[PDB]
Amino acid sequence: EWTPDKLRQKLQTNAHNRLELPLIMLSGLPDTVFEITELQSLKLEIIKNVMIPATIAQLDNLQELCLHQCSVKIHSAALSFLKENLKVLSVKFDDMRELPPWMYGLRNLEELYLVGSLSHDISKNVTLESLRDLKSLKILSIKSNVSKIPQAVVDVSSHLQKMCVHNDGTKLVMLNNLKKMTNLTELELVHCDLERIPHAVFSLLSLQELDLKENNLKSIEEIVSFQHLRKLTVLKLWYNSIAYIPEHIKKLTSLERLFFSHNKVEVLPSHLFLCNKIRYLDLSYNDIRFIPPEIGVLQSLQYFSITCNKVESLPDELYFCKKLKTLKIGKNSLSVLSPKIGNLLFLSYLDIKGNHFEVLPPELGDCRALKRAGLVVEDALFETLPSDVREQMKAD
Amino acid sequence: LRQRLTKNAQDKLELHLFMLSGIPDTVFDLVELEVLKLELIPDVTIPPSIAQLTGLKELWLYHTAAKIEAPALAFLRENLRALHIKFTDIKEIPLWIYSLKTLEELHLTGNLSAENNRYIVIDGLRELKRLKVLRLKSNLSKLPQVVTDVGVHLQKLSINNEGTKLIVLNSLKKMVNLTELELIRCDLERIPHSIFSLHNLQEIDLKDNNLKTIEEIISFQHLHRLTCLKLWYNHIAYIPIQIGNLTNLERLYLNRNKIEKIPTQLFYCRKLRYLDLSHNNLTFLPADIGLLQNLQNLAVTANRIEALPPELFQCRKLRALHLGNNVLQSLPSRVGELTNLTQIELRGNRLECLPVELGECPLLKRSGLVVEEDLFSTLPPEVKERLWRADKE
């Protein structure tokens, strides 16, 4: 049925910039797959009871597999070759059998994407506890209901660098495992049903990026020990229900990426602005009433997204900070725009869509890095500008 | 067979006959066909109906023991110009290929070296007169004396031994008309002096020769015509400064090597156009790249370059900036000054966000701008509309 020409014309690229074959809705693998020796990945989608021959040894460029609902078997020399060649895996298991036990036999694995539907009997998975065989595993993305963190995660405490869970509405418990992370740098607990910050997350000592998206955090209180995460620069806490940020965030002086958008914060604190190192501050779609005038300390802030908030009064202290490059105040509750905006030499983004304005001042021509495509304004207010001011951002 | 017709890399009409009992006469009834591909055809005879195949110029013989009719033999003698022969046994090669006179391109892939058949079977290529391209993927232990006899008129010598070293013995001195030499997978471990004795070469490829050291290139100024020094897929860990003497290089393919630092003397050559240093150990890019104004496709894919200097954007002729799989923290806005950029690769990097000025390039489109979707979302929806329109319009 399948000629090598058909597989050559089937060839395309994946989301990881690799040459991937998207074999979808088939009975098995063709033997003409291995004639394309330049292949770097195969996407097997719903191809069950597949037996991989040893001819996979011809796939010297192969470094990735993506198994989507495939109960695939492999042969011994093919197993050895993929043990000595493969780096990336991504297996989805709608059914338990679709997750193969052979895939843990490799040792050159770096990145794993364990999407699927895991049963709640997680500690019984000896197939999981075989990730200790992998001596280079650094990325582990489990898109499944991980109620209790496996001791498989314990066995890969050091070599792991990226840890991702999409728990999908299940509470993440048995915190001692995440306490046992030593050299983990990126913790991505997306929707782990965390009613607050776990003590396990806070027992991390080498974290660099923490994401608690869609986790209903109640407070950020234990921060007296975030000072030990001097390696941390990225705090991802948006799409949450946090209502306040206390002074305790002053403990981390290496924080650069801060996410607090779509939150329940009704008034932005000034002690949050007391920190000056923060370069990325995201607070879009929040309930913020006003900005305290202590934001002038935040000079290094290159991203202050306050767009789609409830903010009615914007102080002039924010316009003193000239390093703010990406500024979005669209769909806010402002009335007039500050004339003093020309000191922002580095200002590429300005978004003011939806917000009520009376007259656009000529001082919008004072911005130097502003662009017409970067200045997202309605056509009606595009008309309400001087022709020279129009050309100031329109002509490149 | 009309719907079976395809086109090759040389834009010629093509027809691949794979695993047939013989060869159809309706294939031979075709007139628009240019390259017919005979693969795994067991013991067929060529009918004289090849007189209909006037546009036929490339006969591709893959494991095909072909017997030949005399009028078809004369027609192929006066028409056929490119023959590729792959065989598993030295008896599989047809003996009428020597009678061909209009043949210039020959691709003898498969072991010519055998006991008492080591280049004695192809001793009949002395009958070949206009042969200019002689590809030999044949595991040759030593280069034949027959090509030393033939190479007066030979213009390209692509030898693939797949892991067997050539004892060249400076025998290319009698072979003076080469413009291209592609020694690929020869495991030479050093550059021989036969390339140095030659003078007419303009494209030198030494792919996968396990070249640990390339210090000989100081003498390459003797080769006044070289324009493509493809020193890729080797074990090259450094570049000697005498490459600065090589001002005539236009494409310097050093990718998949172990080079960790570029000396600035390499950056003296103003004629470099394709500086591919991908899959290497480079940690920084020198600013003198702004001097290389003729550079078009700078591929530093999968390197250790953390920050692009602004002087990189001094060269306005960058057409394809392959920055993928690197550790680029942020791409400076000076890329908005570039106009010739058609495809930039940023997926797989440490890129925090895509700057707005990236949309300033006119010829860039979504197919050209390959990047992660969330990184694409960082551009303004009006700038994103411009780029999505470049995808559409």
GROMACS .gro file of C-alpha atoms in nm, chain B residues 31-337:
model
  307
  427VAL     CA    1   0.812   1.153  -2.583
  428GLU     CA    2   0.817   1.413  -2.305
  429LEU     CA    3   1.014   1.190  -2.066
  430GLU     CA    4   1.367   1.306  -1.981
  431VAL     CA    5   1.494   1.083  -1.697
  432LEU     CA    6   1.377   0.720  -1.678
  433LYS     CA    7   1.473   0.537  -1.357
  434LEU     CA    8   1.528   0.160  -1.393
  435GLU     CA    9   1.537   0.018  -1.039
  436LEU     CA   10   1.529  -0.356  -0.960
  437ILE     CA   11   1.443  -0.470  -1.313
  438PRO     CA   12   1.556  -0.834  -1.356
  439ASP     CA   13   1.717  -0.912  -1.694
  440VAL     CA   14   1.531  -0.693  -1.942
  441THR     CA   15   1.618  -0.600  -2.301
  442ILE     CA   16   1.594  -0.240  -2.422
  443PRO     CA   17   1.364  -0.221  -2.727
  444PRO     CA   18   1.459   0.010  -3.016
  445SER     CA   19   1.133   0.202  -2.951
  446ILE     CA   20   1.366   0.433  -2.753
  447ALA     CA   21   1.374   0.627  -3.082
  448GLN     CA   22   1.046   0.774  -2.955
  449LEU     CA   23   1.223   0.881  -2.632
  450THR     CA   24   1.395   1.181  -2.788
  451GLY     CA   25   1.395   1.391  -2.470
  452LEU     CA   26   1.551   1.098  -2.282
  453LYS     CA   27   1.894   1.206  -2.158
  454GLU     CA   28   1.950   1.032  -1.820
  455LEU     CA   29   1.930   0.653  -1.796
  456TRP     CA   30   1.927   0.554  -1.428
  457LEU     CA   31   2.028   0.189  -1.378
  458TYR     CA   32   1.971   0.051  -1.027
  459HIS     CA   33   2.049  -0.322  -0.993
  460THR     CA   34   1.928  -0.372  -1.351
  461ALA     CA   35   2.108  -0.619  -1.577
  462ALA     CA   36   2.017  -0.471  -1.915
  463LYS     CA   37   2.061  -0.633  -2.255
  464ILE     CA   38   2.056  -0.399  -2.551
  465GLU     CA   39   1.934  -0.403  -2.912
  466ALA     CA   40   2.173  -0.274  -3.178
  467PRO     CA   41   1.960   0.016  -3.317
  468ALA     CA   42   1.879   0.117  -2.959
  469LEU     CA   43   2.252   0.086  -2.886
  470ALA     CA   44   2.326   0.331  -3.167
  471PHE     CA   45   2.051   0.566  -3.049
  472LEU     CA   46   2.185   0.567  -2.693
  473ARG     CA   47   2.535   0.616  -2.835
  474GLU     CA   48   2.412   0.930  -3.012
  475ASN     CA   49   2.158   1.056  -2.754
  476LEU     CA   50   2.215   0.926  -2.400
  477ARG     CA   51   2.436   1.156  -2.194
  478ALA     CA   52   2.406   1.059  -1.824
  479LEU     CA   53   2.419   0.703  -1.687
  480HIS     CA   54   2.409   0.604  -1.319
  481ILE     CA   55   2.502   0.242  -1.249
  482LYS     CA   56   2.442   0.081  -0.910
  483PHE     CA   57   2.524  -0.289  -0.885
  484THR     CA   58   2.587  -0.551  -0.618
  485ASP     CA   59   2.801  -0.778  -0.839
  486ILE     CA   60   3.070  -0.662  -1.080
  487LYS     CA   61   2.903  -0.875  -1.349
  488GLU     CA   62   2.579  -0.675  -1.317
  489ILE     CA   63   2.723  -0.369  -1.496
  490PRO     CA   64   2.635  -0.381  -1.868
  491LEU     CA   65   2.929  -0.423  -2.105
  492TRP     CA   66   2.776  -0.191  -2.366
  493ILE     CA   67   2.824   0.118  -2.148
  494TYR     CA   68   3.174   0.151  -2.294
  495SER     CA   69   3.030   0.179  -2.646
  496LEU     CA   70   2.846   0.495  -2.537
  497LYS     CA   71   3.006   0.807  -2.682
  498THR     CA   72   2.772   1.094  -2.584
  499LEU     CA   73   2.792   1.001  -2.214
  500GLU     CA   74   2.946   1.262  -1.985
  501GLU     CA   75   2.805   1.186  -1.637
  502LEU     CA   76   2.874   0.845  -1.484
  503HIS     CA   77   2.778   0.737  -1.131
  504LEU     CA   78   2.941   0.401  -1.056
  505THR     CA   79   2.804   0.336  -0.707
  506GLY     CA   80   2.895  -0.008  -0.578
  507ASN     CA   81   3.224  -0.190  -0.528
  508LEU     CA   82   3.451  -0.179  -0.833
  509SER     CA   83   3.738  -0.328  -0.628
  510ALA     CA   84   3.747  -0.707  -0.658
  511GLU     CA   85   4.010  -0.975  -0.715
  512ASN     CA   86   4.126  -0.949  -1.080
  513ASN     CA   87   3.825  -0.722  -1.142
  514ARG     CA   88   3.976  -0.427  -0.952
  515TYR     CA   89   3.928  -0.156  -1.219
  516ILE     CA   90   3.986  -0.409  -1.500
  517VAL     CA   91   3.611  -0.418  -1.569
  518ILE     CA   92   3.603  -0.038  -1.595
  519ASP     CA   93   3.925  -0.043  -1.796
  520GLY     CA   94   3.682   0.014  -2.085
  521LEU     CA   95   3.610   0.369  -1.971
  522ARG     CA   96   3.913   0.456  -2.183
  523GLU     CA   97   3.661   0.418  -2.466
  524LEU     CA   98   3.454   0.688  -2.293
  525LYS     CA   99   3.577   1.025  -2.422
  526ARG     CA  100   3.347   1.304  -2.299
  527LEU     CA  101   3.313   1.176  -1.941
  528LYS     CA  102   3.327   1.475  -1.706
  529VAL     CA  103   3.141   1.364  -1.390
  530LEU     CA  104   3.256   1.034  -1.238
  531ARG     CA  105   3.086   0.954  -0.907
  532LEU     CA  106   3.236   0.646  -0.738
  533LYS     CA  107   3.059   0.521  -0.425
  534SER     CA  108   3.255   0.201  -0.445
  535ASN     CA  109   3.474   0.148  -0.132
  536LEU     CA  110   3.796   0.202  -0.330
  537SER     CA  111   4.105   0.108  -0.129
  538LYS     CA  112   4.332   0.294  -0.372
  539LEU     CA  113   4.227   0.524  -0.654
  540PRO     CA  114   4.241   0.352  -0.995
  541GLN     CA  115   4.509   0.402  -1.256
  542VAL     CA  116   4.230   0.413  -1.514
  543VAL     CA  117   4.103   0.742  -1.375
  544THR     CA  118   4.460   0.872  -1.387
  545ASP     CA  119   4.442   0.786  -1.758
  546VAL     CA  120   4.096   0.941  -1.801
  547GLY     CA  121   4.116   1.253  -1.579
  548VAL     CA  122   4.263   1.473  -1.853
  549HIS     CA  123   3.902   1.540  -1.955
  550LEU     CA  124   3.732   1.463  -1.621
  551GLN     CA  125   3.584   1.767  -1.445
  552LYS     CA  126   3.434   1.617  -1.127
  553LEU     CA  127   3.553   1.326  -0.910
  554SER     CA  128   3.308   1.231  -0.633
  555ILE     CA  129   3.459   0.933  -0.449
  556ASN     CA  130   3.268   0.778  -0.158
  557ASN     CA  131   3.447   0.488   0.008
  558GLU     CA  132   3.212   0.482   0.311
  559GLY     CA  133   3.510   0.438   0.543
  560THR     CA  134   3.815   0.344   0.333
  561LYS     CA  135   4.119   0.570   0.313
  562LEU     CA  136   4.261   0.674  -0.025
  563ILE     CA  137   4.632   0.636  -0.091
  564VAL     CA  138   4.624   0.921  -0.342
  565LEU     CA  139   5.003   0.927  -0.404
  566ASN     CA  140   4.973   1.268  -0.576
  567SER     CA  141   4.827   1.101  -0.886
  568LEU     CA  142   4.588   1.389  -0.966
  569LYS     CA  143   4.866   1.591  -1.134
  570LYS     CA  144   4.779   1.428  -1.468
  571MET     CA  145   4.414   1.511  -1.388
  572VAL     CA  146   4.419   1.883  -1.461
  573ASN     CA  147   4.066   1.970  -1.576
  574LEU     CA  148   3.874   1.916  -1.250
  575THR     CA  149   3.655   2.203  -1.136
  576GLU     CA  150   3.493   2.008  -0.850
  577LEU     CA  151   3.630   1.742  -0.614
  578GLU     CA  152   3.394   1.577  -0.363
  579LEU     CA  153   3.584   1.337  -0.137
  580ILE     CA  154   3.298   1.230   0.091
  581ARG     CA  155   3.316   0.972   0.373
  582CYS     CA  156   3.672   0.875   0.277
  583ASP     CA  157   3.819   0.877   0.633
  584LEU     CA  158   4.128   1.053   0.499
  585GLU     CA  159   4.211   1.208   0.842
  586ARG     CA  160   4.430   1.464   0.656
  587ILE     CA  161   4.413   1.679   0.338
  588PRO     CA  162   4.624   1.511   0.059
  589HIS     CA  163   4.864   1.719  -0.159
  590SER     CA  164   4.697   1.610  -0.485
  591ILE     CA  165   4.430   1.877  -0.434
  592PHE     CA  166   4.718   2.120  -0.377
  593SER     CA  167   4.897   2.020  -0.698
  594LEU     CA  168   4.578   2.088  -0.896
  595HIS     CA  169   4.489   2.444  -0.994
  596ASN     CA  170   4.152   2.445  -1.170
  597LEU     CA  171   3.936   2.343  -0.872
  598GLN     CA  172   3.657   2.580  -0.767
  599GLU     CA  173   3.438   2.356  -0.545
  600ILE     CA  174   3.627   2.143  -0.291
  601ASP     CA  175   3.425   1.913  -0.066
  602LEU     CA  176   3.600   1.705   0.202
  603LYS     CA  177   3.289   1.580   0.380
  604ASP     CA  178   3.330   1.322   0.659
  605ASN     CA  179   3.703   1.277   0.593
  606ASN     CA  180   3.770   1.282   0.972
  607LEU     CA  181   3.979   1.598   0.926
  608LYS     CA  182   4.110   1.665   1.276
  609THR     CA  183   4.353   1.936   1.160
  610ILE     CA  184   4.322   2.158   0.852
  611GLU     CA  185   4.651   2.347   0.892
  612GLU     CA  186   4.752   2.288   0.528
  613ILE     CA  187   4.510   2.554   0.395
  614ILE     CA  188   4.793   2.812   0.391
  615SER     CA  189   4.892   2.662   0.056
  616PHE     CA  190   4.533   2.699  -0.069
  617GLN     CA  191   4.617   3.049  -0.193
  618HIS     CA  192   4.789   2.858  -0.475
  619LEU     CA  193   4.437   2.750  -0.578
  620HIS     CA  194   4.332   3.087  -0.716
  621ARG     CA  195   3.988   2.968  -0.832
  622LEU     CA  196   3.837   2.792  -0.528
  623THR     CA  197   3.499   2.931  -0.423
  624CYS     CA  198   3.336   2.662  -0.205
  625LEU     CA  199   3.548   2.493   0.064
  626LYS     CA  200   3.300   2.241   0.206
  627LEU     CA  201   3.495   2.133   0.514
  628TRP     CA  202   3.188   1.997   0.692
  629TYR     CA  203   3.108   1.675   0.880
  630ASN     CA  204   3.472   1.647   0.991
  631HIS     CA  205   3.655   1.655   1.325
  632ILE     CA  206   3.775   2.014   1.276
  633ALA     CA  207   3.820   2.172   1.619
  634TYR     CA  208   3.978   2.505   1.516
  635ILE     CA  209   4.041   2.721   1.210
  636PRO     CA  210   4.397   2.837   1.133
  637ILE     CA  211   4.440   3.207   1.061
  638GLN     CA  212   4.578   3.140   0.710
  639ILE     CA  213   4.217   3.099   0.593
  640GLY     CA  214   4.232   3.479   0.583
  641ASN     CA  215   4.460   3.435   0.281
  642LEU     CA  216   4.167   3.258   0.109
  643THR     CA  217   3.987   3.568  -0.015
  644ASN     CA  218   3.825   3.378  -0.303
  645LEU     CA  219   3.594   3.165  -0.084
  646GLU     CA  220   3.223   3.227  -0.137
  647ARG     CA  221   3.065   2.937   0.057
  648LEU     CA  222   3.248   2.802   0.362
  649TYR     CA  223   3.052   2.501   0.489
  650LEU     CA  224   3.206   2.419   0.828
  651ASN     CA  225   2.888   2.283   0.988
  652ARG     CA  226   2.880   1.968   1.205
  653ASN     CA  227   3.239   2.029   1.317
  654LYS     CA  228   3.401   2.075   1.659
  655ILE     CA  229   3.512   2.437   1.610
  656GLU     CA  230   3.471   2.638   1.930
  657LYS     CA  231   3.611   2.980   1.834
  658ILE     CA  232   3.620   3.172   1.505
  659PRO     CA  233   3.949   3.360   1.457
  660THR     CA  234   3.901   3.713   1.327
  661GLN     CA  235   4.133   3.637   1.033
  662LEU     CA  236   3.863   3.410   0.887
  663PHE     CA  237   3.643   3.720   0.904
  664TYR     CA  238   3.878   3.905   0.666
  665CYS     CA  239   3.737   3.728   0.358
  666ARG     CA  240   3.485   3.972   0.211
  667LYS     CA  241   3.357   3.724  -0.050
  668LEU     CA  242   3.190   3.483   0.195
  669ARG     CA  243   2.821   3.440   0.112
  670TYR     CA  244   2.711   3.115   0.285
  671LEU     CA  245   2.870   3.104   0.631
  672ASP     CA  246   2.719   2.784   0.770
  673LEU     CA  247   2.874   2.709   1.110
  674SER     CA  248   2.582   2.508   1.246
  675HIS     CA  249   2.601   2.221   1.498
  676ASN     CA  250   2.937   2.343   1.628
  677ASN     CA  251   3.089   2.459   1.958
  678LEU     CA  252   3.080   2.835   1.894
  679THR     CA  253   2.991   3.030   2.209
  680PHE     CA  254   3.020   3.386   2.074
  681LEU     CA  255   2.995   3.558   1.736
  682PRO     CA  256   3.260   3.824   1.661
  683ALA     CA  257   3.143   4.171   1.563
  684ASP     CA  258   3.359   4.169   1.248
  685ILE     CA  259   3.069   3.977   1.086
  686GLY     CA  260   2.941   4.326   0.999
  687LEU     CA  261   3.233   4.355   0.757
  688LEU     CA  262   3.105   4.049   0.566
  689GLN     CA  263   2.854   4.246   0.362
  690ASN     CA  264   2.810   3.972   0.100
  691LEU     CA  265   2.690   3.717   0.357
  692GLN     CA  266   2.340   3.590   0.278
  693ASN     CA  267   2.262   3.276   0.482
  694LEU     CA  268   2.429   3.273   0.823
  695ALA     CA  269   2.336   2.934   0.972
  696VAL     CA  270   2.465   2.903   1.329
  697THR     CA  271   2.198   2.645   1.417
  698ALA     CA  272   2.250   2.452   1.743
  699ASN     CA  273   2.540   2.657   1.881
  700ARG     CA  274   2.624   2.817   2.216
  701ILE     CA  275   2.572   3.178   2.100
  702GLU     CA  276   2.385   3.356   2.380
  703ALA     CA  277   2.361   3.710   2.239
  704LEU     CA  278   2.372   3.835   1.882
  705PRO     CA  279   2.591   4.146   1.849
  706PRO     CA  280   2.431   4.448   1.680
  707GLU     CA  281   2.709   4.440   1.419
  708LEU     CA  282   2.555   4.115   1.291
  709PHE     CA  283   2.275   4.334   1.155
  710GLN     CA  284   2.530   4.563   0.990
  711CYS     CA  285   2.535   4.314   0.701
  712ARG     CA  286   2.212   4.399   0.518
  713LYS     CA  287   2.227   4.102   0.278
  714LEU     CA  288   2.126   3.836   0.533
  715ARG     CA  289   1.860   3.631   0.351
  716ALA     CA  290   1.821   3.327   0.582
  717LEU     CA  291   1.930   3.375   0.944
  718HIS     CA  292   1.917   3.019   1.080
  719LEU     CA  293   1.929   3.093   1.453
  720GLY     CA  294   1.735   2.785   1.562
  721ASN     CA  295   1.825   2.551   1.849
  722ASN     CA  296   2.064   2.813   1.993
  723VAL     CA  297   2.065   2.984   2.334
  724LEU     CA  298   1.974   3.330   2.203
  725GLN     CA  299   1.825   3.515   2.499
  726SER     CA  300   1.679   3.804   2.299
  727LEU     CA  301   1.691   3.908   1.934
  728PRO     CA  302   1.776   4.279   1.893
  729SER     CA  303   1.544   4.514   1.706
  730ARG     CA  304   1.813   4.594   1.446
  731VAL     CA  305   1.677   4.300   1.242
  732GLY     CA  306   1.415   4.553   1.131
  733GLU     CA  307   1.685   4.717   0.918
   0.00000   0.00000   0.00000
